[PDB]
Amino acid sequence: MDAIKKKMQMLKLDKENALDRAEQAEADKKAAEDRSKQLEDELVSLQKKLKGTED
Amino acid sequence: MDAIKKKMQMLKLDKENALDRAEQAEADKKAAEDRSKQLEDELVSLQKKLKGTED
Amino acid sequence: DFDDIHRKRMEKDLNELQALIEAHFENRKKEEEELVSLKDRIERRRAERAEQQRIRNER
């Protein structure tokens, strides 16, 4: 009819916005966790270098 | 009718799924970010003690 | 944000659209009421034509 189509369009705009936000948040999580794990690896290498210096 | 109900329910389900997924991702992002901050703070002190050891 | 104004815009869009939806609902509803009254007076016309035709045929 008439109002039904507009209501469906609203329900679809919500769909697109929610899905896009979810995808963007997932990408953010991937990037942040990669950052953290690379920092942890750098910390490990520093520990090993400290061990060599102690030797 | 029949089509309106199923389509509307499926679209609302899609919106809710995307929202909850985004919230989970953002929570993990915040936790990883704070842990990364902890890693930075500990790494600086590790560098300082390494520098003293080298001196 | 841009998402906020976009949300308010699609919101008022939904509001005006459902408003016009209920509006044409009411309009076509009045038209259906008028058409029902038309059918009723039509059946009145059928009955009156039937009785007068039958009287003519009786005579």
Q: Give the span between the Cα atoms of A4 and B9, in whole angstroms.
A: 14
DSSP B1-55: --HHHHHHHHHHHHHHHHHHHHHHHHHHHHHHHHHHHHHHHHHHHHHHHHHHHH-
Gyration radius from chain B CA atoms: 24
Do residues A21 and B21 touch, judged by C-beta distance below 8 A?
A: no
Searching chain C, which residue's CA lies closest to the CA of residue A14?
C7
Partner residue opposite A15 with nearest CB, options B14, B25, B50: B14
Stated resolution in angstroms: 4.9
DSSP chain C: -HHHHHHHHHHHHHHHHHHHHHHHHHHHHHHHHHHHHHHHHHHHHHHHHHHHHHHHHH-
Q: Give the span between the Cα atoms of C21 and A3, in whole angstroms.
A: 4
Q: Give the span between the Cα atoms of C35 and C21, in whole angstroms.
A: 21
> Are A39 and B42 inside 8 Å of each other by CB?
no
- For A35, half-sphere exposure in the C-beta direction (CA atoms, 13 angstrom radius) is 18
Is B55 part of the contact surface with chain A (CB cutoff 8 Å)?
no
Q: Give the span between the Cα atoms of B50 and A12, in whole angstroms.
A: 57
- Between helix C2-58 and helix A3-54 the angle, nearest 10°, is 160
Of B36, B50, B30, the closest CA to residue A40 belongs to: B36
Is B10 part of the contact surface with chain A (CB cutoff 8 Å)?
no
Question: Technique behind this structure?
Answer: cryo-EM
